[PDB]
Structures are given as C-alpha cells and as structure tokens.
Amino acid sequence: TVAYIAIGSNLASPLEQVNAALKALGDIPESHILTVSSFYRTPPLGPQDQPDYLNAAVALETSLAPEELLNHTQRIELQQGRVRKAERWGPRTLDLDIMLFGNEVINTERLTVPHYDMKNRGFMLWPLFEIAPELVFPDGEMLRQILHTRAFDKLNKW
Ligand SMILES: Nc1ncnc2c1ncn2[C@@H]1O[C@H](COP(=O)(O)O)[C@@H](O)[C@H]1O
Ligand SMILES: Nc1nc2ncc(COP(=O)(O)OP(=O)(O)O)nc2c(=O)[nH]1
C-alpha cells in the first residue's frame, strides 16, 4: 500500500533534522520510500513570531497496517524529534503525519485518515501535489480540485 506522509520541522536550521527523519522513514520495516517532495519553507500558523516550517511529502510503500505505521512514525518523533539544546533536550520540532493510506478511510481513537485538516493547509497540499498531482481521495475529491478551489499560493522552496 502506498502511504503519504507529511513532514514538518520548525527548527531554526531544520535540514539535518528533516534528513534524519527521512532516513528513519526509509528504515521502517516492511516499507520503502518511493519518492520525496522538494523541501518547502512556510510561515507557521498562529502568530508570526515563530520560526518557519520546512515541509515535505513522502510516498512510502508499505505492507504494515495503518496503526503499525503510526507506531513507527510516533517512535521516530520520540527518538529524533528533539534537538539537544545546551542544558537539555529541546522541544519537539518534528511532525510526521499520515495524510493518506492507500484508498482507506480510518477513524479510530488514534488515527484519522485522510489527515483531519490537510484540505485547509497548502503546506500539506502543495508538497503532495508535487509528488501525486493526479491524486484522488477515498471519497472522490481530487487533490487538484482542492487546490484549484482554494487557490492557496504555491510555496517557496527551502
Ligand atoms: N493521520 C494522522 N497522523 C499522525 N497522527 C494522527 C493522525 N490522525 C490522528 N493522529 C493523532 O494525532 C496526535 C497528534 O500527536 P502530536 O503530534 O504529539 O500533537 C496523535 O495522538 C495521533 O494519535
Ligand atoms: N507552515 C506550517 N505551519 C504549521 N502550523 C501548525 C502545525 C501543527 O498542527 P497540528 O498537529 O494540527 O496541531 P498543533 O500545531 O497544535 O501541534 N504544523 C505546521 C506545518 O507543518 N507547517
């Protein structure tokens, strides 16, 4: 099954964190990376006195179950999601989200697939669109259609 994973990091200098995350995604068992989007630079949500985010999309081929895949992405967030600040480990700055999982719809305590708010977020839609422009959601909506309708600006690359 082809799973699409969103990556976000709002570290001040996130390239190594994001690359460590990508390698970690590549090491998940029963799975392999098919494609990775460009890296984009996006302003954060809420107030603008915060660091920008690096966002990207990853296509992962996997024979894991959705919630097993979620165990792995949450494990990576726990192991790699904090950078060591001088006196301590800093706040988590890495987000890994399952946007789509094959054509499946999932509504569990732990997992909402398609991602619960991706259609509001160009920083999720545009990286996905770069690696799956023809994508159709389980319910028949089309990724192209959502971007056309909302007209979210194209993102700047990192
Ligand atoms: N598609 C998804 N991808 C990643 N986390 C998800 C998803 N759907 C629901 N979640 C839940 O979202 C929470 C986000 O955790 P956190 O990143 O610490 O804010 C987790 O507790 C997950 O169980
Ligand atoms: N530009 C950009 N802005 C963002 N703002 C908020 C969240 C995180 O959203 P969510 O998990 O839904 O909730 P919370 O921010 O409270 O963790 N992620 C990004 C991101 O990836 N890129």
Domain of residue 133, CATH code: 3.30.70.560
| Domain interval for residue 126 | 1-158
Ligand 2 atom nearest the C-alpha of 43 is 1
Quick one: which of 30, 32, 4, 1 has its CA closest to 96? Answer: 4
Q: How far apart are CA 106 and CA 115, in angstroms?
A: 9
Nearest-CA residue for atom 5 of ligand 1: 97
Q: How many domains does the chain have?
A: 1
Q: Cβ contacts of residue 133 below 8 Å, gap of 6+?
A: 143, 144
Q: Is the CB of residue 17 less than 8 Å from the CB of residue 9?
A: yes
Quick one: which of 34, 113, 103 has its CA closest to 67? Answer: 113
Whether 110 is a known active-site residue: answer no
What CA–CA distances, in Å, run from 142 to 18, 25, 118, 133?
28, 26, 13, 9
How long a stretch of residues is the chain?
Answer: 158
Q: How far apart are CA 127 and CA 144, in angstroms?
A: 12
Q: Is the CB of residue 51 less than 8 Å from the CB of residue 89?
A: no
Q: How far apart are CA 32 and CA 45, in angstroms?
A: 31
Q: How far apart are CA 43 and CA 53, in angstroms?
A: 6
Does ligand 2 lie within 6 Å of residue 65's CB atom?
A: no
What technique determined this structure? X-ray
Instruction: Cite the DSSP H helix spans in the chain.
Output: 15-26, 66-80, 122-131, 143-150
Nearest-CA residue for atom 13 of ligand 1: 110
| Beta-strand runs (E) in the chain | 2-9, 31-36, 40-42, 53-62, 82-84, 89-92, 94-101, 106-107, 112-113, 156-157
